[PDB]
């Protein structure tokens, strides 16, 4: 209840941590630990009736975010773990079910079968990109194919539970919490050309409500970097 | 020199051997290891996780997220079937493309038990009851709620808990996992009555596979 980091404070009341391991620290990489370790609340998305899903590429949603974004232009390298708090707040008269899954190395697929998607289309900075429940056509050149039953990666979307995940059932549950360690092949990588995590929120059972209730429900994502450090002097 | 004598099957290439081989690049000083999280030592750890079962195919929901949702509504006749699916393997069943059933298509003989978890994603104010019938191999599919009750079953009160587990065995009539309305869905005013159920499947941790082959999911 009412946890705080730096100059921010959020409140909480069930956590699922990564692949079982907890994030920790390692020329010489220096340790900045107090200046940017805080809760970065992104803006809320609206869960409507015929909504399809959302995604965020994770070391890119915190690129225009304050002093964390200032520490990226000053540093060529870095390695960072995360802690993600997702909560949506509806009444007891709404009903639905969300899957909050955190995918490492999620290559997206382009709509044209020869090309590859562009950086403006793969990831909106600190802004959610949307799945669709129709097909993106082949005629446009560089756009992400977002048929949500394939999850944009050419796979069964029901089998996405092999990644570290959490269900949000409005009947019983209210929030989700993930703690994701640093997963990469190299120990310290180029932070400008690599988005090594992807946070997806997909409504399996759609939102429903009776006439009179509030016709859409907000979802609030909060990311807090754990064990961030960069390389330089 | 030392007298040797070469036997049959000497200068042959058997593709399934294990022999020492001369290294093309010695003196390279290979890159050391690194602790990356999430190591897989066996394929049965991939099968032990829960995955959503597309139990609502119906030829127009397969290109949707509606394939995973079982429709539940408050009708007027007491005693009806919600869903039902056989446990016959391979012949286009519903546990086929799931994350368990993708490993068991790489082998020819496998035999064990299955967890089946159901989750009621309806309102918090809706109540009701369900029967969860399992017919063993040899016994027919039940055609009433009554003779479904006379077999093995679980009565699932939705208002108490929102998740019910049912464990069956699955070996390479072979079974049925039908489910029935015991009572209707009682709902207050200003609450919707059309609710859905999701179904998860897993491996019940204790089984084995033999004789690896290649998957039928390719051109």
């Amino acid at each position, epitope marked *: 209840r009412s946890i705080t980091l730096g100059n921010s404070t959020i409140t909480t009341q069930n956590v699922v941590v990564g692949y079982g391991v907890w994030p920790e620290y390692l020329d010489q990489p220096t340790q900045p630990d107090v200046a940017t370790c805080r809760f970065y609340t992104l803006e809320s998305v609206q869960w409507m009736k*015929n909504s399809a899903g959302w995604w965020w590429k994770l070391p890119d949603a915190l690129s225009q975010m304050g002093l964390f974004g200032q520490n990226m232009q000053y540093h060529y390298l870095g390695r960072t773990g995360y802690t993600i708090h997702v909560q949506c707040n509806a009444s007891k008269f709404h009903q639905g079910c969300l899957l909050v899954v955190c995918v490492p190395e999620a290559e997206m697929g382009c709509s044209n079968l020869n090309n590859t998607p562009e950086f403006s289309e793969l990831s909106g900075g600190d802004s959610a990109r*949307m799945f669709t429940d129709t097909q993106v056509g082949e005629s446009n050149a560089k756009k992400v194919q977002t048929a949500v039953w394939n999850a944009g990666m050419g796979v069964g979307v029901g089998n996405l539970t092999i990644f570290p995940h959490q269900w949000i059932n409005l009947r019983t549950n209210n929030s989700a919490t993930l703690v994701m360690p640093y997963i990469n092949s190299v120990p310290m990588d180029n932070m400008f050309r690599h988005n090594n995590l992807t946070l997806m929120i997909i409504p399996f059972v*759609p939102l429903n409500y009776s006439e009179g209730s509030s016709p859409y429900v907000p979802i609030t994502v909060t990311i807090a970097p754990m064990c961030a450090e960069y390389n330089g002097l | 020199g030392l007298p040797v004598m070469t036997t049959p099957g000497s200068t042959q290439f058997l593709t399934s051997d294990d022999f020492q081989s001369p290294s093309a690049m010695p003196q390279f000083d290979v890159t050391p290891e690194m602790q990356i999280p999430g190591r897989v030592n066996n394929l049965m750890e991939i099968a032990e996780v829960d995955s959503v079962v597309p139990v609502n195919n119906t*030829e127009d929901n397969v290109s949707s997220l*509606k394939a995973y949702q079982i429709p539940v509504q408050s009708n007027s006749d007491n005693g009806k079937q919600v869903f039902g699916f056989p446990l016959q393997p391979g012949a286009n069943n519903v546990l086929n493309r799931t994350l368990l059933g993708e490993i068991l298509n790489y082998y020819t003989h496998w035999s064990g038990s299955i967890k089946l978890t159901f989750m009621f994603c309806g309102s918090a104010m809706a109540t009701g009851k369900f029967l969860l019938a399992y017919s063993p191999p040899g016994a027919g599919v039940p055609k009433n709620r009554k003779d479904a009750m006379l077999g093995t079953h679980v009565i699932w009160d939705v208002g108490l808990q929102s998740s019910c587990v049912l464990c069956v065995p699955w070996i390479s009539a072979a079974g049925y996992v039908t489910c029935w309305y015991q009572t209707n869905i009682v709902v207050p005013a200003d609450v919707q009555s059309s609710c859905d159920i999701l179904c998860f499947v897993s491996a019940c941790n204790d089984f084995s596979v033999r004789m690896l082959k290649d998957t039928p999911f390719i051109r």
Partner: antibody
Amino acid sequence: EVKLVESGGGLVQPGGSLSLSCAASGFTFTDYYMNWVRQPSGKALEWLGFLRNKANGYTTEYSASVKGRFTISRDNSQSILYLQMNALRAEDSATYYCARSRYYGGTYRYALDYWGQGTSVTVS
Amino acid sequence: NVLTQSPPIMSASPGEKVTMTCRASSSVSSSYLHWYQQKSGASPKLWIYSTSNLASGVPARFSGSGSGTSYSLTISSVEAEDAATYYCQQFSGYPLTFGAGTKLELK
């Protein structure tokens, strides 16, 4: 009741521009897909494009024949659907309809349930 | 993916059964094939959606069928007020292609 009227057609020199407009009343505008279909004099129909609802982000999907020339949009104030036609040719002389789609299960079948009365566009 | 309708011109007296077919070039799914009806000097109307389901306000004389790459539409009893043109729509990829048109004139 559902009522889709539209307006804006007329005469145009080939190589010019024209803007059609579809006025929608009788339903919530931000919840359905809205299409654009043309038909020449006594020929088959031809689908030009649609525009998805608010929950899918108002993205557009043009046909391969008119991609780059035409533009579908909407007005954020009132329930008016637009069609900016640019670089008109000799074979664009047709009757332009305005259609709507809905979800039948929870799925999106690609049908067009309600149609507009049709404005006529011809070139000279 | 183009659709061919046959016959183009169809004539039949009222009271009998007549049918038309719409054969696709490739495989189209059963849920993405629809039938429309356009009278002379009027906009089209959705008639049958997803190859078997009657729309709203349509009389029960019609029933669509077919699967794979061959689809059809049957009229059990022909009246006088349902003489129009009938088109079939599909979706395999983009774009949404229509039929050629089947004109029904009463005899």
